[PDB]
Specification:
There is one protein chain. This protein has helices spanning 54-57, 74-77; strands at 7-17, 20-31, 36-45, 83-91, 96-106, 109-119, 132-135, 138-145, 148-159, 164-175, 185-196, 202-212. It is mainly beta. It has a single domain (1-214), classed as Green Fluorescent Protein (Beta Barrel). The chain has an eleven-stranded mixed beta barrel with strand order 1-2-3-12-11-8-9-10-4-5-6. A hairpin with a 4-residue loop joins β9 and β10. The chain binds magnesium ion (MG) (6 copies). One magnesium ion (MG) is lined by residues 16, 21. InterPro entries: GFP (IPR009017), GFP-related (IPR011584), Green_fluorescent_prot (IPR000786). Belongs to the GFP family. Cu(2+) 1 binds at residue 196.
Length: 214
């Protein structure tokens, strides 16, 4: 089959935050049918990153989500051709991040061409001050619109001093070929940085995702 139980990941992110350019590359592996994945990320340019690494993590593939048999899988259907996604991440203090990921497939390895751009993060805010701890688990709401798939999610970053920092995600997924469209459904997520060094030049990221419906 096109989608194998065990697959790889190759990616390169080029981006900027408040005008500060940077570049990150990574390699990883995951189990598409189990909804689990892991990757090692290395900052190649712009290091050391002057902002909270957490704003980048959800940008570093919904194929890695366990879909039950009674819910159409827009993502696994899209291959070998693949799909691409666009997303705006609106933080409560005005910081806004736009990201895109063009996903292709070469053998058993997915290739990500990522672009990330964030602006208006206050200098004394939790992102520029690196006050974030982690993203809380979430439930993404997916629905069809204009022949493509939308995914919206209320995200929250736990803060070092206590409390949370909210962000609203709005993603558009676009398959590179005609695939069956799903009915309204959900995808639970839980992304975690398992390990990292002092300035985050090296990061080990993990994610577990499962779809569910009414
Ligand atoms: Mg730039
Ligand atoms: Mg302020
Ligand atoms: Mg803070
Ligand atoms: Mg419609
Ligand atoms: Mg570095
Ligand atoms: Mg449900």
């Amino acid at each position: 089959s096109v989608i194998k139980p065990d697959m790889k990941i190759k990616l390169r992110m080029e981006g900027a935050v408040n005008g500060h350019p940077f570049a990150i590359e990574g390699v990883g592996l995951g189990k598409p049918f189990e909804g689990k994945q892991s990757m090692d990320l290395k900052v190649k340019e712009g290091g050391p990153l002057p902002f909270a690494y957490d704003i980048l993590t959800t940008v570093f593939n919904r194929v890695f989500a366990k879909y039950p048999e009674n819910i159409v899988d827009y993502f696994k259907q899209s291959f070998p051709e693949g799909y691409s996604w666009e997303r705006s991440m609106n933080y409560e203090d005005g910081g806004i991040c736009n990201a895109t990921n063009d996903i292709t497939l070469d053998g058993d390895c997915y290739i990500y061409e990522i672009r990330f751009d964030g602006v208006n993060f206050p200098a004394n805010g939790p992102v520029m001050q690196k006050r974030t701890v982690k993203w809380e688990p979430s439930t993404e709401k997916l629905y069809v619109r204009d022949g493509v798939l939308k995914g919206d999610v209320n995200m929250a970053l736990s803060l070092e001093g206590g409390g949370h920092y909210r962000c609203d995600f709005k993603t558009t997924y676009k398959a590179k070929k005609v695939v069956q469209l799903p009915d309204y459904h959900f995808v639970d997520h839980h992304i975690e940085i398992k390990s990292h060094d002092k300035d985050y030049s090296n990061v080990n990221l993990h994610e577990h995702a499962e779809a569910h419906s009414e």
